[PDB]
Symmetry: D3
C-alpha cells in the first residue's frame, strides 16, 4: 500500500517517554504597582537508553531545578525518576527510572556514519499537547560536532529524540538558545555518539568531566616565545609539551604556535585556554598548528 | 523516473477550489487625530464534497459575514455559491455551488484508519497568491480528536484540504487561533470523519446541533451527594441517569462521580456541564468515572 | 528673596507618609521551557486625615492584597497600620496607624471651590526612590467629578496627595489604568470632598455603599411605555417613582423618559440601571430627563 | 489670596471653542483572514479670531477631510461651521461659524515681542475628555520661526490656543508629526503673527499662496557660472535678478552665490529652489549670500 | 538499505560554492546621545554554471556593493571572483572565478518540465554556519513565472540552489523582501530557465536588458480612442502597432484595448507601460486583449 | 507688567554654550543580508565655569570618544575646546576653550542651601534643535546626593545647566541611563557643589580620584570576628582602624560592625568594600554602624 513511517514509528515509540518535572526556583519579589521560592512545571521528552537500569536521556533545560520528576511511557504507565547528572553546555541530562519494568531501550546508531542527504525523524513535545512526530533530512553536520535537521517544529520547544529510518537513535535534539527552549529556524542536536559518551560520564561521575588541557606554554611575543621563529607570527605560542596530555599524543612539541580550532583562528594564547577548556572529555577537535605544516586531531584525556 | 506527488496531485486538484468572499462587518468609527459598515474581502480554499449538489466544504473564518461568495475551479471556471451552514467552534462551513456542472468530488478516507507515521499533503492559500501545495506526515492524533501535521506553512493562513497518498480526504486544515488565520508552528485539522458528520448536520439543520447532555445529577458534597460514599472524594457527583441520554447507554447509574474527560480531571459538576455541552453531536469523548472501576466512551445523542 | 514652595511644603510634608506594603497573591505556576502564592511588595504615599485615630488615606492599588502594611513619617518614624476599607472603583483606601502619636493631619480644602487656573502641587513616589514633589495647575474639572492636573510625573506611578498653595488637601491622585499604576499623559485625582465622603463610608461600613437606585420603570416601547407619548422617542422609559429614592426628590414622576447622565445619552433602560448603580453614595450626577423640559441633579441615598 | 490663572482664564475661555468633525476618507478594503469610503470623527480646539464673521482658527489635521463640522462654545452653545481654507504645511485651518451671535474674539499679541523666559498657557483637548488647560514657559523661539513651549501635554494631541498672562493669543499649538497628532516631548506652535498672516490668505484666496521665488540663476560650475569668481566656491550660483522678486529688494544682483537659509548651508541650486518654494508668502527667511560679505532678510512677494 | 539524498547530494555538492563578500557602503553618521563609508560583510551561496569560464550564479543581495568577493569550493579550495553583472529586480547576479581549475558545473534541468507534486531540495546558508541542505516539493508555479517550494528554512536567508532528484538545477532561491534576506513562510525562486536567460544577458551586456515595449497607442477616452468601439469600455486603448515590436508578432493591430497582464486587470494605459517595462527581455507574459476574443502570449524583443 | 524668566534668563544665557562633538568609535562590521572605526556626532550643552581659563563643564556622554570638540556661545561665536577630564560615573566632564575671550562665567550657588519647594529652570538641547529652556521645582534631594526636578523634557536628552531664580548654578542635569541620553520621567542632576568638587579633581588630576577606603577589617563570622559580640549579628565586621583613613576620623575603632550606607543595609563585608569604593573623593556618605549606638558621616580622603 502507501509508504509510511508508522510501521517503524511503532517500534520506536515505546522507547520514547514523556517527562513531567515539578521544581522550585529563586525569583525576585515583584515590585508594584506595575527573593522568594517559586514553583514551576517543566515538560519534555526523553529516550530510554538503558532498559535494565532504566536510564532515560533528556534535556538539561527540562530537568534543571527539579524537585519531582515523573515519567510516562507511551503505553500510559507512569514511574518516578531520579536525577543522575546534567550538562548545561550541551543541554543533556540523565535521569533514572525508579522501579523499571518491561522497558524497551532504543538501539543507538553510530552517528559517525551520518551523511547529509540522510532522512531523519524527530519525536517530542513542541507545545506540550503530547508527543509530536516530524520528519526531514540531515541538513548539516558539524563535522562530516552537531546535527542540524529540517525535521524541526517552528516556534516549538526543542523536543527529544532524533531517529533514522531503521528507528535507531542518531541524536537528541537540543535548544541552542538556553534558557529559552525555542527554534532558530532549523533543528540542532547532539549526535548520538557524543550523547553516549556524555551520558556515561554522568553515570560514572555525576557530571561530564571538562578536559581543559593545554600543556604549559608561554604567550607569543614573550621571553621564551620571541626567541624562536617569529616568521609568520600572529598567534598563540606553545613553549612546553611534557605534561603528555594529548600533546605527546598530538605530535606537538616545544616551540609550536597553534592558531586554529576547527576553522576559527586562535588569536591569543588564552583564546586556546578557554575554548579547549569548556569542551567535554572525549571530544574530537582539530588544531591548525603553525610550524610550516602541522594539523593533528586531539582526543581529550 | 523520479518519484513525485504531481501524478496523484493531478487527480486531486480538480476537487479543490478557490473561494473569493466579499462581505460587510460592523466596525468602530475611527477617532482622530491618531458604528459603521465596512466592506472586506476574505479568501480561502475548499473541497467539493458532493459533486451533484455542488457541496463545498470550507473554513468558517473564510465565509463568515459573507455577502457574496464566488468559487473558481482549478480549471478556471467560476460559479456563485450560497452559504448553507457554519460552525465557529471547529471552523468548518458548508457552501453550495449555484449551477454545478462537470464537478469532481473528492473521495474521503476513513480518518479512523490514520496512524502517526503516515504521509499527508496540504492544499490551500497561505498568502493569497494562489493554490499552494505542501507535504509532511501525521505528527499527532487527538485520539489514536484532531489531526496535527508538519505539512503546514509558516506564518501562513490555515489552508483547506488535507490529503493522503491515494489522493483521498483525511481532513480540513483549520486555524486554532480564530479570528486570526495563522500558524502555531504546526498544522491542526478536523479529521475527515468529524468533517463528514459535521457537514451533514449543516445540510440537515443549518448548523451542527450541540449535544449538551449530562443527565440530572447533584453537586458533590450536597444533600443527596454526601449521603453516599465520599471515600476517595473530590470530583463531580452524579445523582440521576433516567433521561437515558447516553447514560442508560454509558452504563452510568445513580451515585456515580465522574472526574475525567479524555484525560483532563473534572473538578466541579458544572465543569462537566460546560465541557460536554460545547461539543458537536456524534462526538466520541471518554469519561473517567469514579466508583472503583469505570470508564466508558459516549456518543452524543 | 526668591519665591518658593518650600515654606508651605514644610508645613504639609509632616501629614504625608510613605506606605510599605507586603502581600501575597495567587498566580499561575510557570510553564517551561519558556496555582500558587507569590509574595510581592507594593509601595505608595498617603495622607494623615485624622491625627487622633491615625487615619491615613491612600490608593487601593497600593494596599490591595496586603498582609503587612507599614507607615513611615517624613521625620523617619515608622508605625504599623491596619486596613480599614478600600474602593477599587475610585482607587481609594483607608488605613489606620497602630499606636498613633504626635501626628499631624492635613487641612482639607473644599474642592467645590476649585477653578481651572488654580495652582496645585503633587506629593508621592513615582519611581520608589522616595517622596517626590511636583507642581502644576488645575487642568480640568469633571464638574465645575474628577481633577485633572499637569502637576503629574511622566511614566510615574500615580502618587498620593494633591495640594493647593495654602497647603490644604484638594485631592488624592489616582491611576485610571488599574491594575497598572501609570500615566496617561496628565494627572487624574479624586477631589478632596469626594475623598472625604468616600473615606467616611469606609470607617462606618468597611466599604463605600453602592447607590444603585433607579425607581421601578419599564423599558421604552413596552406595554406601559408605548401607551404614553412616544413623541420624540428613543431613550429609557420610566414607569414608576413611588420608592421615593431620589425620585420623589428628583422631582421625577411616572411617564418620564431619561436619556442622559452628565452628557452621555442614555440609550437603553438598563444603561441607566448600570451606570447609576456602580457609583458611590452621595454622588452628584445630572439626568437629562425627557418630558419637554426637565433636568435635575440627584444625591444618592 | 492665592495666585491663580483662573481669573484671566475666565476671560480667555469664551474665545476658545470645541470642534467636532465628521468626515469620510478613502481606505483599503481589509484582506482576511488576518477601495471604499470610511466614516471617521476628528476632534480639536480652536480660537474665535473674528467675532463678527465668526472666524475660528484651528488645526488642519482636525478639519481635514471634513463633511460636517460643529462648534461648541465654552458656555454650551453649538453652531454649524463651514470650511474656508487649510494649510497642511503649517497645520493651520480657518473655519467659519454659520450664524455667529454674541461671540467673543481673542486679542492677539504681537508674537515678535516674545522672549524665552516668558510664561504661556495652552488650552485644548489632549485626550478628547474636554477642554484641558496647562501652563509653562517659552522654551525656544525659531527666530528671536516657531514657538516651542514646555506647556504641552505628554502623549497628548497638539491642542489649540497658546496664550500669555494677559490672556492674549501668542500662537496655535500644532503637531509636527502629521498625520499623527502627538508629542515629541515638547510643544511646537505657529507664532500668532504667522498665524494671522496665514489666516488672511485663507480668507482672501481659499489657501495660503506659496512664494516659490528665486529669480533666474544658473547652477554653480556651469557656463555663465564658472566664468566668474570660483574663489571660495561650493554653493548655489545666482546669474540674474531682473525679475525684481525680493532680489532687487534683497539687494541681490548678478553673480551672487547664496549658500545659506537661516543657518543650514545651501548645497545645490535646486536646494534653494525647493526650500524657499515650500514656504508661505510674507515669510521672513535669511540668506547667507557669498560675495565677500552679504546676508539680507527677504519678505515673500 | 535506507533511502537517502546523500548519494545524489554528493554529486551536486561540488557545483555549489560559498561566497564571502566584503564591501563598503555609504551610511548616515550616527547622531548622539542615543555621510561616511562603512565596511560590511555579506555571505551567500552560488552555483557553478560554466565550469570552463568559472561562471558562478548567485544572488544580487549578496554581491551588491562588493569590493572583494571570494569563493570557496565544497572541497575547501578558495578562489577570487570578479563581478560580471547583477539584477536587483530578480535578485540574480553572475560572478566569475579568477583562475578556475578542476571545476564542476551543474546540469540545468528544463524548468518548463516542472509540475507541482515534484520533489526538490535547497542548498545554502540560512544562518551563516555553513552549507545547509533541506528538502520539500514544488508548492506552486507562477505559470504551469516563479517557483514556490516548502523546501525553505524558517527565519533563514534565501539560500542559493534549488535542485531535483537527479541533482539538476531547477532554480535559484531568492528573497522577495529585499534588501532583507528572509522568509515569508515559504520559498520563492527564479526557475532555472529564467535563470539561464537572465544570466546570458549579464555575460553579454553587463546587465539584463529591460524590454519596455508597448507599441504606440493613445489612452482610452481620448481623441483617436473614443472614436471607435467603446462598447465594453474601461481599459487601456491601443492606437498603433507598426513598430513591429511583438505587436506585428502578438497578432495585435490598431484599435485594440488590452486590459490584462497574466490575470491582473490593466486599468490605465500607463499601467501597461510600466508593468511590461520593468520585466526582463525574453519574458513570457500574457495579455488579455479586448476586441471580442483575443489573448496572445508575447516574447520580449 | 507680566512676570517672566526672560530677564534673568538674559543674564544666564551667555554662560551657557552649545557643544558640537565629532568622534570615532570601534564598531562591529555589519553581517548581511539583514571591527572598524565609525564616525559619529554628539551634541550637548555646557556651562562656562571659569571665564579666564575658559573652563566649560559638560556631560561625559557628550564629549566621550571625541576627536574634535567645538563650542558656540549664545552670541554666535565659535571656539575650539580641548578635553581635560571626564567621569562616567556621574556623567560629568570638563572641557577647555582654546583662546577664551570676553567670556562670562556663571555664579554657582551653594547647593547645600537647596530645599524641595524651590524653583529651578533647565537649559539644554533635548532634540538638537537648539538651546531649549524649561522650568519646574526641586522635586527631591538625595540628601536634604542628587537633584531631582520636574523641570525636565519628556523623551529628551538630559540637557546641561540647572539654575535658580537668581540665575546661579545649582547643578548639571545628567542621564542616569547611560549610554542612553534620555528621560525616566523626571530630571536627575549632580548638585552644583558635587559638581565643583568633581570638576577641580579633573583640572588637578585628569580625573576624579576614587576614594575606595575601608580600613582593614575581617568578615563577620570569621576568626577575629566571631570572637567578640555576635549579639545582634548579621552584617559587615570591622577588625582594624589604624590606617586613620576617615576611621580615626569616623570615630570608628576595632570590633565595629557596619551595616548601612545612607539607608541601604550593608549585608556582606565586600558590600562595603565595593559601594564605598566607586564613589568620588570628598563624598559625604553616612554609615549605620552597629555597636549599640553609632552612626557618623564620613568625608573621603
Amino acid at each position: 500500500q502507501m509508504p509510511s513511517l508508522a510501521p517503524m514509528l511503532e517500534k520506536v515509540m515505546p522507547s520514547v517517554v514523556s517527562i513531567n518535572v515539578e521544581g522550585s526556583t529563586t525569583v525576585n519579589t515583584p515590585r508594584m504597582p506595575r527573593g522568594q521560592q517559586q514553583k514551576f512545571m517543566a515538560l519534555g521528552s526523553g529516550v530510554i537508553i538503558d532498559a535494565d537500569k532504566g536510564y532515560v536521556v533528556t534535556n538539561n533545560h527540562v530537568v534543571d531545578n527539579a524537585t519531582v520528576i515523573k515519567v510516562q511511557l507511551s503505553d500510559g504507565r507512569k514511574f518516578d525518576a531520579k536525577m543522575v547528572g546534567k550538562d548545561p553546555r550541551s543541554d543533556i541530562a540523565l535521569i533514572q527510572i525508579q522501579n523499571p519494568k518491561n522497558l524497551t531501550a532504543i538501539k543507538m546508531a553510530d552517528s559517525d556514519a551520518l551523511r547529509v542527504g540522510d532522512y531523519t525523524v524527530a519525536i517530542g513535545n513542541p507545545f506540550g499537547l503530547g508527543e509530536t512526530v516530524t520528519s526531514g533530512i540531515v541538513s548539516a553536520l558539524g563535522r562530516s560536532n552537531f546535527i542540524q535537521t529540517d525535521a524541526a517544529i517552528n516556534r516549538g520547544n526543542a523536543g527529544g529524540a532524533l531517529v533514522n529510518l531503521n528507528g535507531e537513535l542518531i541524536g537528541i535534539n537540543t535548544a541552542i538558545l538556553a534558557p529559552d527552549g525555542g527554534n532558530i529556524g532549523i533543528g540542532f542536536a547532539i549526535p548520538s555518539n557524543m550523547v553516549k559518551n556524555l551520558t556515561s560520564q554522568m553515570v560514572e561521575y555525576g557530571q561530564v568531566k571538562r578536559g581543559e588541557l593545554g600543556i604549559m606554554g608561554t604567550e607569543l611575543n614573550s621571553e621564551l616565545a620571541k626567541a624562536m621563529k617569529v616568521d609568520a607570527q600572529r598567534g598563540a605560542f606553545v613553549s612546553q609539551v611534557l605534561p603528555n596530555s594529548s600533546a605527546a599524543k598530538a605530535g606537538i612539541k616545544a616551540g609550536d604556535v597553534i592558531t586554529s580550532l576547527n576553522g576559527k583562528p586562535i588569536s591569543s594564547f588564552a583564546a586556546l585556554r578557554a575554548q579547549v577548556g569548556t569542551m567535554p572529555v572525549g571530544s574530537k577537535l582539530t588544531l591548525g598548528l603553525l610550524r610550516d605544516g602541522k594539523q593533528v586531531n586531539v582526543n581529550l584525556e
